[PDB]
């Protein structure tokens, strides 16, 4: 899910807002992955 991020980053170099929301969604999903698997860490 960072492929879209890198694609728009290379295309522009608007898009930054999409970049930020995708990053936030990815990090939040990772956070809930950690919380769900908190015991086995």
């Amino acid at each position: 899910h960072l492929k879209e991020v890198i694609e728009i980053l290379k295309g522009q170099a608007g898009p930054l807002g999409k970049i930020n929301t995708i990053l936030r969604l990815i990090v939040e999903r990772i956070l809930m992955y950690t919380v769900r698997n908190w015991c086995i860490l």
């Binding site: 990053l23 990090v27 919380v35 015991c39």
Partner: peptide, 24 residues
């Protein structure tokens, strides 16, 4: 890419950690 958590978000996270510990 670090994200910030509101206080209610912190309560959510810690309650979820408690639930996971209780159930696992």
């Amino acid at each position: 890419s670090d994200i910030l958590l509101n206080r209610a978000y912190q309560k959510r996270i810690w309650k979820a950690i408690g639930c996971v510990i209780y159930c696992f």
